[PDB]
Design an enzyme around this catalytic site. Structure first.
Site, PDB file in Angstrom:
ATOM      1  N   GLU A   1       7.204  -0.223   5.422  1.00  0.00           N
ATOM      2  CA  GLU A   1       6.393  -0.526   4.253  1.00  0.00           C
ATOM      3  C   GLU A   1       5.084  -1.128   4.736  1.00  0.00           C
ATOM      4  O   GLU A   1       5.072  -1.936   5.670  1.00  0.00           O
ATOM      5  CB  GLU A   1       7.099  -1.497   3.300  1.00  0.00           C
ATOM      6  CG  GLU A   1       8.245  -0.876   2.526  1.00  0.00           C
ATOM      7  CD  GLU A   1       8.700  -1.741   1.369  1.00  0.00           C
ATOM      8  OE1 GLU A   1       8.564  -2.979   1.462  1.00  0.00           O
ATOM      9  OE2 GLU A   1       9.190  -1.183   0.363  1.00  0.00           O
ATOM     10  N   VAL A   2       3.983  -0.730   4.106  1.00  0.00           N
ATOM     11  CA  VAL A   2       2.644  -1.084   4.555  1.00  0.00           C
ATOM     12  C   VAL A   2       1.981  -1.934   3.482  1.00  0.00           C
ATOM     13  O   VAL A   2       2.012  -1.587   2.295  1.00  0.00           O
ATOM     14  CB  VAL A   2       1.808   0.167   4.874  1.00  0.00           C
ATOM     15  CG1 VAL A   2       0.405  -0.219   5.308  1.00  0.00           C
ATOM     16  CG2 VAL A   2       2.489   0.972   5.958  1.00  0.00           C
TER      17      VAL A   2
ATOM     18  N   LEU B   1       0.802  -1.217   0.000  1.00  0.00           N
ATOM     19  CA  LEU B   1       0.000   0.000   0.000  1.00  0.00           C
ATOM     20  C   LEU B   1       0.836   1.268   0.000  1.00  0.00           C
ATOM     21  O   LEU B   1       0.361   2.311  -0.461  1.00  0.00           O
ATOM     22  CB  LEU B   1      -0.934   0.017   1.212  1.00  0.00           C
ATOM     23  CG  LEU B   1      -1.897  -1.170   1.279  1.00  0.00           C
ATOM     24  CD1 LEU B   1      -2.695  -1.149   2.572  1.00  0.00           C
ATOM     25  CD2 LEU B   1      -2.822  -1.168   0.073  1.00  0.00           C
ATOM     26  N   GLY B   2       2.062   1.207   0.500  1.00  0.00           N
ATOM     27  CA  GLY B   2       2.906   2.381   0.530  1.00  0.00           C
ATOM     28  C   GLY B   2       4.217   2.065   1.211  1.00  0.00           C
ATOM     29  O   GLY B   2       4.358   1.053   1.907  1.00  0.00           O
ATOM     30  N   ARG B   3       5.183   2.954   0.989  1.00  0.00           N
ATOM     31  CA  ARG B   3       6.506   2.844   1.585  1.00  0.00           C
ATOM     32  C   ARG B   3       6.920   4.206   2.109  1.00  0.00           C
ATOM     33  O   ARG B   3       6.773   5.213   1.412  1.00  0.00           O
ATOM     34  CB  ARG B   3       7.541   2.339   0.574  1.00  0.00           C
ATOM     35  CG  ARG B   3       8.978   2.631   0.990  1.00  0.00           C
ATOM     36  CD  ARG B   3       9.949   2.491  -0.168  1.00  0.00           C
ATOM     37  NE  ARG B   3      10.137   1.100  -0.560  1.00  0.00           N
ATOM     38  CZ  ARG B   3      10.932   0.708  -1.551  1.00  0.00           C
ATOM     39  NH1 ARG B   3      11.612   1.605  -2.250  1.00  0.00           N
ATOM     40  NH2 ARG B   3      11.044  -0.581  -1.844  1.00  0.00           N
TER      41      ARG B   3
ATOM     42  N   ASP C   1       2.400  13.399  14.615  1.00  0.00           N
ATOM     43  CA  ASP C   1       2.362  13.269  13.165  1.00  0.00           C
ATOM     44  C   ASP C   1       0.922  13.324  12.670  1.00  0.00           C
ATOM     45  O   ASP C   1       0.525  12.574  11.773  1.00  0.00           O
ATOM     46  CB  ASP C   1       3.051  11.982  12.702  1.00  0.00           C
ATOM     47  CG  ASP C   1       3.501  12.048  11.256  1.00  0.00           C
ATOM     48  OD1 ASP C   1       3.514  13.158  10.679  1.00  0.00           O
ATOM     49  OD2 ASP C   1       3.840  10.984  10.697  1.00  0.00           O
TER      50      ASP C   1
ATOM     51  N   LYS D   1       9.914   6.304   5.043  1.00  0.00           N
ATOM     52  CA  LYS D   1      11.283   6.237   5.536  1.00  0.00           C
ATOM     53  C   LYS D   1      11.456   5.137   6.577  1.00  0.00           C
ATOM     54  O   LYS D   1      12.551   4.578   6.710  1.00  0.00           O
ATOM     55  CB  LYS D   1      11.685   7.600   6.107  1.00  0.00           C
ATOM     56  CG  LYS D   1      13.025   7.647   6.825  1.00  0.00           C
ATOM     57  CD  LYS D   1      13.437   9.087   7.107  1.00  0.00           C
ATOM     58  CE  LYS D   1      14.428   9.175   8.260  1.00  0.00           C
ATOM     59  NZ  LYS D   1      15.617   8.301   8.062  1.00  0.00           N
ATOM     60  N   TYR D   2      10.389   4.789   7.301  1.00  0.00           N
ATOM     61  CA  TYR D   2      10.499   3.890   8.439  1.00  0.00           C
ATOM     62  C   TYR D   2       9.740   2.577   8.299  1.00  0.00           C
ATOM     63  O   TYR D   2       9.883   1.714   9.175  1.00  0.00           O
ATOM     64  CB  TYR D   2      10.026   4.597   9.720  1.00  0.00           C
ATOM     65  CG  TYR D   2      10.924   5.733  10.153  1.00  0.00           C
ATOM     66  CD1 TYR D   2      12.173   5.481  10.704  1.00  0.00           C
ATOM     67  CD2 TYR D   2      10.524   7.058  10.010  1.00  0.00           C
ATOM     68  CE1 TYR D   2      13.001   6.512  11.101  1.00  0.00           C
ATOM     69  CE2 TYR D   2      11.347   8.098  10.407  1.00  0.00           C
ATOM     70  CZ  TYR D   2      12.585   7.818  10.952  1.00  0.00           C
ATOM     71  OH  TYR D   2      13.414   8.843  11.350  1.00  0.00           O
TER      72      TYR D   2
ATOM     73  N   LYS E   1       2.376  -3.731   8.720  1.00  0.00           N
ATOM     74  CA  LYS E   1       3.355  -2.650   8.655  1.00  0.00           C
ATOM     75  C   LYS E   1       4.720  -3.239   9.004  1.00  0.00           C
ATOM     76  O   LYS E   1       5.006  -3.523  10.171  1.00  0.00           O
ATOM     77  CB  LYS E   1       2.956  -1.520   9.599  1.00  0.00           C
ATOM     78  CG  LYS E   1       3.876  -0.316   9.587  1.00  0.00           C
ATOM     79  CD  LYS E   1       3.350   0.721  10.564  1.00  0.00           C
ATOM     80  CE  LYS E   1       4.265   1.921  10.682  1.00  0.00           C
ATOM     81  NZ  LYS E   1       3.649   2.949  11.573  1.00  0.00           N
TER      82      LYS E   1
HETATM   83  C1  LIG Z   1      -5.039   2.175  -1.174  1.00  0.00           C
HETATM   84  O1  LIG Z   1      -6.106   1.482  -0.518  1.00  0.00           O
HETATM   85  C2  LIG Z   1      -5.932   1.382   0.832  1.00  0.00           C
HETATM   86  C3  LIG Z   1      -6.904   0.724   1.575  1.00  0.00           C
HETATM   87  C4  LIG Z   1      -6.766   0.595   2.949  1.00  0.00           C
HETATM   88  C5  LIG Z   1      -5.682   1.173   3.593  1.00  0.00           C
HETATM   89  N1  LIG Z   1      -5.549   0.975   4.893  1.00  0.00           N
HETATM   90  C6  LIG Z   1      -4.430   1.414   5.461  1.00  0.00           C
HETATM   91  C7  LIG Z   1      -4.326   1.188   6.824  1.00  0.00           C
HETATM   92  C8  LIG Z   1      -5.286   0.450   7.524  1.00  0.00           C
HETATM   93  O2  LIG Z   1      -6.266  -0.036   6.960  1.00  0.00           O
HETATM   94  C9  LIG Z   1      -4.849   0.004   8.742  1.00  0.00           C
HETATM   95  C10 LIG Z   1      -4.103   1.044   9.485  1.00  0.00           C
HETATM   96  C11 LIG Z   1      -2.996   1.462   8.738  1.00  0.00           C
HETATM   97  C12 LIG Z   1      -3.214   1.608   7.424  1.00  0.00           C
HETATM   98  O3  LIG Z   1      -2.160   2.110   6.885  1.00  0.00           O
HETATM   99  C13 LIG Z   1      -1.278   2.363   7.806  1.00  0.00           C
HETATM  100  C14 LIG Z   1      -0.066   2.892   7.673  1.00  0.00           C
HETATM  101  C15 LIG Z   1       0.723   3.082   8.790  1.00  0.00           C
HETATM  102 CL1  LIG Z   1       2.272   3.766   8.668  1.00  0.00          CL
HETATM  103  C16 LIG Z   1       0.191   2.704  10.004  1.00  0.00           C
HETATM  104  O4  LIG Z   1       0.932   2.871  11.130  1.00  0.00           O
HETATM  105  C17 LIG Z   1      -1.073   2.154  10.107  1.00  0.00           C
HETATM  106 CL2  LIG Z   1      -1.667   1.702  11.653  1.00  0.00          CL
HETATM  107  C18 LIG Z   1      -1.794   1.995   8.992  1.00  0.00           C
HETATM  108  C19 LIG Z   1      -4.688   1.813   2.855  1.00  0.00           C
HETATM  109  C20 LIG Z   1      -4.824   1.935   1.475  1.00  0.00           C
END
Ligand SMILES: COc1ccc(N/C=C2\C(=O)CCc3c2oc2cc(Cl)c(O)c(Cl)c32)cc1
Length: 329
Positions: free
Chosen positions: A51-52, A44-46, A155, A48-49, A67
């Site tokens: 990757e999710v 879902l993303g990256r 943050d 500095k600290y 995470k």
């Molecule tokens: C692009 O489509 C989507 C669909 C769902 C999501 N959901 C992200 C998250 C959650 O569903 C749980 C909590 C959580 C999410 O991203 C995080 C990042 C950090 Cl860094 C963190 O500390 C936590 Cl706790 C979370 C993200 C993108």
């Protein structure tokens, strides 16, 4: 000489009364799960600290978010884990469901409840006046909770607020920068995203407290009701303070640094200038006026103050007339 010390005006001594284990996160022992309980689906993303990832608990076919922390700092890892466990169950706090050792990174991987979040750039364009008040109140519940537990998030920003708008569900996330508040402790000012850094961070005042989060929330509120994201759009940390000064004025900025005997970076000598305080009505136009009310501007005015000690606390903010129209749980 030097800077004048500062104390939080609420929850000042909560940690010094609790057991050492509550805040001594360096001595914390992690209870590990089974990493093969989870199947990674898509990144879902990256940052500095970390990757999710979106993942599936393959034992019950349940969606989760994993995470995977980067091995940059070990003290920072135990800090986020201890804070998530301390705050688990609190209103609108993201629930840490499990902790496993990732086999590839060999670092802790945090397993969170899944939220069907819509991207904030897409979501904020759709929010009504009532929606903004409703979600602001939900964020305040999380902030007052972690503040009452001796923790500042540091943050707060739209990216760290997950919202399932179909179900009106909100979770405050990314506690990787959160810290325990200890009165008199000087903290790192390199926290929060640039657009949401409080003036205390920008003037390099280290003895800040929970009120930092309230400035960041005010920045979010301004971006929502005026539909300008971000509201203070600095090109660097120095221009960020100039952007704030062009709205709040330079006189109150100098009063702020004079009160705490702060000396500005002389880099500001030729860029800060002289600016009058602007009335909030300058930023109202035909495209956002339906989101602006006298209550909204009074509330914003009490969040966006240079003096961190003068900002509304989270608990005070929930008492504000801005939320009178919101139906409470
Ligand atoms: C692009 O489509 C989507 C669909 C769902 C999501 N959901 C992200 C998250 C959650 O569903 C749980 C909590 C959580 C999410 O991203 C995080 C990042 C950090 Cl860094 C963190 O500390 C936590 Cl706790 C979370 C993200 C993108």
């Amino acid at each position: 000489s030097g800077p004048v010390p500062s104390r939080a005006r609420v929850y000042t001594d909560v940690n010094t009364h609790r057991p050492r284990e509550y805040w001594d996160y360096e001595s914390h022992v992690v209870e590990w799960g089974n990493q093969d309980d989870y199947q990674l689906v898509r990144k879902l993303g990256r940052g500095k600290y970390s990757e999710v990832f979106e993942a599936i608990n393959i034992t019950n076919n349940e969606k989760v978010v994993v995470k995977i922390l980067k091995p940059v700092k070990k003290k920072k890892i135990k800090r986020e884990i201890k804070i998530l466990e301390n705050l688990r169950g609190g209103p609108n706090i993201i629930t840490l469901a499990d902790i496993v050792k990732d086999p590839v990174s060999r670092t802790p991987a945090l397993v969170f409840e899944h939220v069907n979040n819509t991207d904030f750039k897409q979501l904020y364009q759709t929010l009504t006046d009532y929606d903004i008040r409703f979600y602001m109140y939900e964020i305040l519940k999380a902030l007052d909770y972690c503040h009452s537990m001796g923790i500042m998030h540091r943050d707060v920003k739209p990216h760290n607020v997950m919202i399932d708008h179909e179900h009106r569900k909100l979770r405050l996330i990314d506690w990787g920068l959160a810290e325990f508040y200890h009165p008199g402790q000087e903290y790192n000012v390199r926290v929060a995203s640039r657009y949401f850094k409080g003036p205390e961070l920008l003037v390099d005042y280290q003895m800040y407290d929970y009120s930092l989060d309230m400035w960041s929330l005010g920045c979010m509120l301004a971006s929502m009701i005026f539909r300008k994201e971000p509201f203070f759009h600095g090109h660097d940390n120095y221009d960020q303070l100039v952007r704030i000064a062009k709205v709040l004025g330079t006189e109150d900025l100098y009063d702020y640094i004079d009160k705490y005997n702060i000396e500005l970076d002389p880099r500001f000598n030729d860029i800060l200038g002289r600016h009058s305080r602007k009335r909030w009505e300058r930023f109202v136009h035909s495209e956002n006026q339906h989101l602006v009310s006298p209550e909204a501007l009074d509330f914003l005015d009490k969040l966006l103050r240079y003096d961190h000690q003068s900002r509304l606390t989270a608990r005070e903010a929930m008492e504000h007339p801005y939320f009178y129209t919101v139906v409470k749980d």
